[PDB]
Design a protein around this ligand. Structure first.
Ligand SMILES: [Mg+2]
Ligand SMILES: [Mg+2]
Ligand SMILES: [Mg+2]
Ligand SMILES: [Mg+2]
Ligand SMILES: [Mg+2]
Ligand SMILES: [Mg+2]
Ligand SMILES: [Mg+2]
Ligand SMILES: [Mg+2]
Ligand SMILES: [Mg+2]
Ligand SMILES: [Mg+2]
Ligand SMILES: [Mg+2]
Ligand SMILES: [Mg+2]
Ligand SMILES: [Mg+2]
Ligand SMILES: [Mg+2]
Ligand SMILES: [Mg+2]
Ligand SMILES: [Mg+2]
Ligand SMILES: [Mg+2]
Ligand SMILES: [Mg+2]
Ligand SMILES: [Mg+2]
Ligand SMILES: [Mg+2]
Ligand SMILES: [Mg+2]
Ligand SMILES: [Mg+2]
Ligand SMILES: [Mg+2]
Ligand SMILES: [Mg+2]
Ligand SMILES: [Mg+2]
Ligand SMILES: [Mg+2]
Ligand SMILES: [Mg+2]
Ligand SMILES: [Mg+2]
Ligand SMILES: [Mg+2]
Ligand SMILES: [Mg+2]
Ligand SMILES: [Mg+2]
Ligand SMILES: [Mg+2]
Ligand SMILES: [Mg+2]
Ligand SMILES: [Mg+2]
Ligand SMILES: [Mg+2]
Ligand SMILES: [Mg+2]
Ligand SMILES: [Mg+2]
Ligand SMILES: [Mg+2]
Ligand SMILES: [Mg+2]
Ligand SMILES: [Mg+2]
Ligand SMILES: [Mg+2]
Ligand SMILES: [Mg+2]
Ligand SMILES: [Mg+2]
Ligand SMILES: [Mg+2]
Ligand SMILES: [Mg+2]
Ligand SMILES: [Mg+2]
Ligand SMILES: [Mg+2]
Ligand SMILES: [Mg+2]
Ligand SMILES: [Mg+2]
Ligand SMILES: [Mg+2]
Ligand SMILES: [Mg+2]
Ligand SMILES: [Mg+2]
Ligand SMILES: [Mg+2]
Ligand SMILES: [Mg+2]
Ligand SMILES: [Mg+2]
Ligand SMILES: [Mg+2]
Ligand SMILES: [Mg+2]
Ligand SMILES: [Mg+2]
Ligand SMILES: [Mg+2]
Ligand SMILES: [Mg+2]
Ligand SMILES: [Mg+2]
Ligand SMILES: [Mg+2]
Ligand SMILES: [Mg+2]
Ligand SMILES: [Mg+2]
Lengths: 201, 64, 144, 117
RNA sequence: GCUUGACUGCGAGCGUGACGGCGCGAGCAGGUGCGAAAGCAGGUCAUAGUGAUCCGGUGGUUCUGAAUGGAAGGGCCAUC
RNA sequence: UAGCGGCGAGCGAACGGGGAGCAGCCCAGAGCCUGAAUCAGUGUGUGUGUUAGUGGAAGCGUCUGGAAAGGCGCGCGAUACAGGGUGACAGCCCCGUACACAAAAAUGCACAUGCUGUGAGCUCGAUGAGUAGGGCGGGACACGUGGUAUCCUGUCUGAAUAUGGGGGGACCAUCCUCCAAGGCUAAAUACUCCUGACUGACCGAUAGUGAACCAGUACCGUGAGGGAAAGGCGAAAAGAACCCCGGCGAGGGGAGUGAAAAAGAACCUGAAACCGUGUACGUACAAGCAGUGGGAGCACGCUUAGGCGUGUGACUGCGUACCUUUUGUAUAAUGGGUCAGCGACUUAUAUUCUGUAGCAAGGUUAACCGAAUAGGGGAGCCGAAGGGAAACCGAGUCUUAACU
């Protein structure tokens, strides 16, 4: 298949197996939720009955007092006691097979083309590293929420888009499954399409 | 951590082609004059673990 | 395809078994454990192979055999693995470079599994009768 | 993700304390007692749904009996006569005519009298 | 009277057992013993006379033998 | 895994491979040599940080409102839309943030750099003795004395010393490899009393540190030691001038402030148990898990002025709580005075099986590299071949001298 170019009115050819396959919601979902799981810091901890500050003295004798038997001031039943199953810092990252991460991106890229959310331009940059510049540039192109994928990391385009919340500037190697779905439109320079062409293979 | 093999079972059971286990027959270590040859001859080849005892062996040999 | 419109496959996210959370759940009260046993205690349960004190199966049966150290350094090679080598020479060294046998294997044997469809020369590897016929039927030759 | 039980336990306890309105003592203001009262009231209502249909047929039969005997026939002969005459009016309606239409009931007893005789 | 079948290695098929096991078994080899031969003999009319595994002992062995040749040790078979 | 193991419970390597990080040396001593490299100290610089700081963009009108940052309208900044405060939610009100600068003095680091101190090289040498080894008793080696190598030594002894000696898992021969009985040595590695910044599918006052609060305090113990409870007015005290009852009280009613005082300091919200005042109905001839089915009467709301809704419930049928444990409980068997808050199948790794997804005779990487959730990394693991104790054979193999 081929993708039309808005900037130059030419055409660019791409693999059908990358930008033209069927959407795999089951596969895309697993990779997406595994991306959000890898963003978890997972830093937290409660105190078990062994870590609560306090002594091991039995509060009162086993028999004769008329009270329910107790053995520790730190029992999870008691207030100011331990947590029964106190959490530890844990790693929530999942393993995503290489053929699934690449397989999920191909389904995401293919669905962007089907929904007319991926548009290809010959080049995309700003003359000066001013935020007011590409803000005006995106008005001309009629874009509000947009992800720009460039072949090479442009410093002016990166700085000029940093303060725009609904604009994200990446490079062809910094593509992630979530950001492709999370943005209304995706702008790929013709160089960037070639790199993901040979990255997703 | 890794499950630990019951080392005593690994010395007595070997896993065959279709997932079964073969074991050596008991009653052939000593006191053999008083045993008929037919009884001992049938007791020489290895046998397969029965259906009831497969659960207790698979548990003891997680890496079989 | 939005971040709030993609859902898992039907039947791939079976919900966990929450134990001891009321009558209606079917798992309340004892939580699948029954009444008043050792198996119903926290941490209770007998070890692997225990049969109540009767001599367990892995102890009333005799041990047999010995572990051979030569079988740890001997491998078997299939006919379908002969094309994986580079250069058409299936030797002991050209077979480790193709990741066909372990780096510390010293004896290899080519058996009749798969099929040979290219002429290859096998040096120093024992070849079964069935594999020798097939290797020579593809124009290959076997060297001692 | 710690979950606090205050809001949902408040609503679950109020849910049945509202069902325990009118009960005496702790059965209408104490949850532990009110839960048992609400459950027991549910058991009673279920079984009296099935014995409301008996307590009313007993009432109808007794009223048909009383009205038929004023016309010179017992209940057992009255019902048997109605079956012979092929009258399908049931106890709820027979006991309704007996109270609100005395003339129709006695004109209906004579229907059973002829069938038996 | 003569003898050593109170054989060797397998056994279709069965009975019992939760299992470990325990039985009955015609038939195939290889070598026998009685009978003229048809045969029958793998202990005793049958059912009790028993003890798993581990650990070792003794004899044998086309197995293994921690650089290599041996060996020690282990394995397998018979047995205590 | 191989092994060790009342061969039980269990313990559990190494060879080898992939990575991070790599660094070598000098005293068992004399000749020339020459202050020679590598080094330790100190000063002098030249940079770069640390210990204060400086500048730092861009908004107005109108509506509700106690108050605007909110709604609506029109603008501007953005290498600054991190964050915080401001009378409700602020890119443009304030503090900041991106960015660009700054050190009199002290000080870390990195080079150059003189001085002080030791020493670089070539030849000739030499080659750690109560030591290696052994006996006895123990210990460490994954290895529990086992056929047990190897290491350490409490006690007895005890070499060869380079034509020599150690190891290669009893031991011997051959071969290979190395040179003990003398030392030094960075990096990769472990931890956080402490300092700074940042982060959290961590908690939010019975939680989170024992301690959000003048907490290791009050209090308890002779002592070691144990060890709490306890947060929130309001935007701003504007924290109630003054009057009245009262003991020149406590407490309260007005007045006033405030958006709000039923926000009044016992102060946001103000639940439940529990305790009252008022109203409607029932209730002093009536027997029991107190309800439920039927049901009159009374009061009350009606908006078709219509039967219904709501409250009560005379009378009446039926009806001995809940949990647990049990063959079986109203049981006079257990537990619970009630309310509110908390309280019990979790987490990590490994293995097996189901569902689902990707690839498919292949699947997949771990550590690590990489800013990279990418990509590299195929070391390995599982599978495609099994039989046998094993050598070994192989769609066969073992069994047997051989199997129909
Ligand atoms: Mg003590
Ligand atoms: Mg706590
Ligand atoms: Mg990867
Ligand atoms: Mg034996
Ligand atoms: Mg059940
Ligand atoms: Mg119980
Ligand atoms: Mg029991
Ligand atoms: Mg049980
Ligand atoms: Mg326990
Ligand atoms: Mg016993
Ligand atoms: Mg490999
Ligand atoms: Mg929370
Ligand atoms: Mg109430
Ligand atoms: Mg058979
Ligand atoms: Mg003869
Ligand atoms: Mg006899
Ligand atoms: Mg007898
Ligand atoms: Mg024993
Ligand atoms: Mg022993
Ligand atoms: Mg040999
Ligand atoms: Mg050897
Ligand atoms: Mg050796
Ligand atoms: Mg031997
Ligand atoms: Mg290495
Ligand atoms: Mg300033
Ligand atoms: Mg400013
Ligand atoms: Mg106004
Ligand atoms: Mg405004
Ligand atoms: Mg407010
Ligand atoms: Mg010594
Ligand atoms: Mg020795
Ligand atoms: Mg041993
Ligand atoms: Mg030695
Ligand atoms: Mg030595
Ligand atoms: Mg030396
Ligand atoms: Mg040395
Ligand atoms: Mg040292
Ligand atoms: Mg606290
Ligand atoms: Mg609070
Ligand atoms: Mg004191
Ligand atoms: Mg006042
Ligand atoms: Mg006074
Ligand atoms: Mg006063
Ligand atoms: Mg006012
Ligand atoms: Mg209020
Ligand atoms: Mg407030
Ligand atoms: Mg209040
Ligand atoms: Mg209240
Ligand atoms: Mg009255
Ligand atoms: Mg009376
Ligand atoms: Mg009365
Ligand atoms: Mg009474
Ligand atoms: Mg009575
Ligand atoms: Mg009713
Ligand atoms: Mg009754
Ligand atoms: Mg109980
Ligand atoms: Mg009893
Ligand atoms: Mg009863
Ligand atoms: Mg009692
Ligand atoms: Mg009781
Ligand atoms: Mg009690
Ligand atoms: Mg309680
Ligand atoms: Mg469990
Ligand atoms: Mg599948």
């Amino acid at each position: 298949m081929e993708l039309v170019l808005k900037d130059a009115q030419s055409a660019l050819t791409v693999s059908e197996t990358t930008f033209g396959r069927d959407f795999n919601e089951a596969l895309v979902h697993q990779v997406v939720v595994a991306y959000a799981a890898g963003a978890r810091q997972g830093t937290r901890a409660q105190k078990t009955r062994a870590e609560v500050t306090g002594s091991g003295k039995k509060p009162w004798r086993q028999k004769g007092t008329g009270r329910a038997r107790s053995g520790s001031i730190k029992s999870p039943i008691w207030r100011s006691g331990g947590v029964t199953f106190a959490a530890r810092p844990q790693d929530h990252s999942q393993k995503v097979n290489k053929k699934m991460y690449r397989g999920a991106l191909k389904s995401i890229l293919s669905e962007l083309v089907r929904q007319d959310r991926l548009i290809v331009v010959e080049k995309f940059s700003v003359e000066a590293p001013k935020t007011k510049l590409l803000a005006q540039k995106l008005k001309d192109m009629a874009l509000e929420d947009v992800l720009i994928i460039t072949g090479e990391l442009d410093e002016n385009l990166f700085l000029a888009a940093r303060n725009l919340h609904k604009v994200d500037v990446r490079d062809a190697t910094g593509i992630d499954p979530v950001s492709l779905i999370a943005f209304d439109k995706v702008v790929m320079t013709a160089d960037a399409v070639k790199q993901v062409e040979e990255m997703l293979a | 951590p890794k499950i630990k093999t019951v080392r005593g079972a690994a010395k007595r059971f070997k896993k065959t082609g279709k997932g079964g286990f073969k074991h050596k027959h008991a009653n052939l270590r000593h006191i053999l004059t008083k045993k008929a040859t037919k009884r001992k001859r049938h007791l020489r080849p290895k046998a397969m673990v029965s259906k009831g005892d497969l659960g207790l062996v698979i548990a003891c040999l997680p890496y079989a | 395809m939005r971040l709030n419109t993609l859902s898992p496959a039907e039947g791939s996210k079976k919900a966990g078994k929450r134990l001891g959370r009321g009558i209606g759940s079917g798992l309340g009260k004892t939580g699948g454990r029954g009444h008043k046993g050792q198996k119903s205690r926290s941490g209770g349960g007998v070890r692997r192979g225990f049969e109540g004190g009767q001599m367990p199966l892995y102890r009333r049966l005799p041990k047999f055999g010995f572990t051979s150290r030569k079988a740890a350094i001997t491998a078997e090679v299939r006919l379908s693995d002969l094309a994986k080598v580079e250069g058409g020479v299936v030797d002991l060294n050209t077979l480790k470079a193709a990741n066909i046998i372990g780096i510390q294997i010293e004896f290899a044997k080519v058996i009749l599994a798969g099929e040979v469809t290219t002429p290859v020369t096998v040096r120093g590897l024992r070849v079964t009768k069935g594999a020798r016929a097939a290797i020579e039927a593809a124009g290959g030759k076997i060297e001692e | 993700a710690r979950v606090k039980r205050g809001v949902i336990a408040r609503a679950r306890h109020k849910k049945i304390l509202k069902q325990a309105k009118g009960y005496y003592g702790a059965r209408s203001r104490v949850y532990r007692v009110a839960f048992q009262a609400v459950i027991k009231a549910g058991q009673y209502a279920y079984r009296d749904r099935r014995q409301r249909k008996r307590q009313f047929r007993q009432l109808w039969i007794a009223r048909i009996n009383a009205a038929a005997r004023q016309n010179g026939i017992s209940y057992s002969k009255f019902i048997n006569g109605l079956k012979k005459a092929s009258v399908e009016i049931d106890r709820k309606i027979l006991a309704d005519i007996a109270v609100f239409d005395k003339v129709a009931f006695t004109a209906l007893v004579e229907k059973a009298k002829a069938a038996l005789a």
